[PDB]
Amino acid sequence: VRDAYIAKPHNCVYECARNEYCNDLCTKNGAKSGYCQWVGKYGNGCWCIELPDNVPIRVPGKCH
Amino acid sequence: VRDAYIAKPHNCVYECARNEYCNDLCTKNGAKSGYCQWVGKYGNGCWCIELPDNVPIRVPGKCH
Secondary structure: OEEEEEEEOOOEEOOOOOHHHHHHHHHHOOOOEEEEEEEEOOEEEEEEEEEOOOOOEOOOOOOO | OEEEEEEEOOOEEOOOOOHHHHHHHHHHOOOOEEEEEOOOOOOOEEEEEEEOOOOOEOOOOOOO
């Protein structure tokens, strides 16, 4: 498992305005919990705790 | 076509913090354009202009 921004196609974050939205998105995908980052590595977006390894995450590179 | 909040499965909005994120999402799904609406019927989320009828929208009920 890993803690990371959960990705949507292709190598993009899910933006967010509140923590519960991210908690729900994360747990639906198997993570323990999640919250909304504002000033993390990739800016605004959902961050998941203990996301299963085969769920895509945001990594270095361009989103589109 | 209708102006509406585009839905993420299942009956969820896409939350947002910048307009390009919504315009990108809405136009990929065939809308004329879209923007990040902070306040509205279904609170913060992407609002699309003239989304095609076959693309789900947020409707009453809970996101799941």
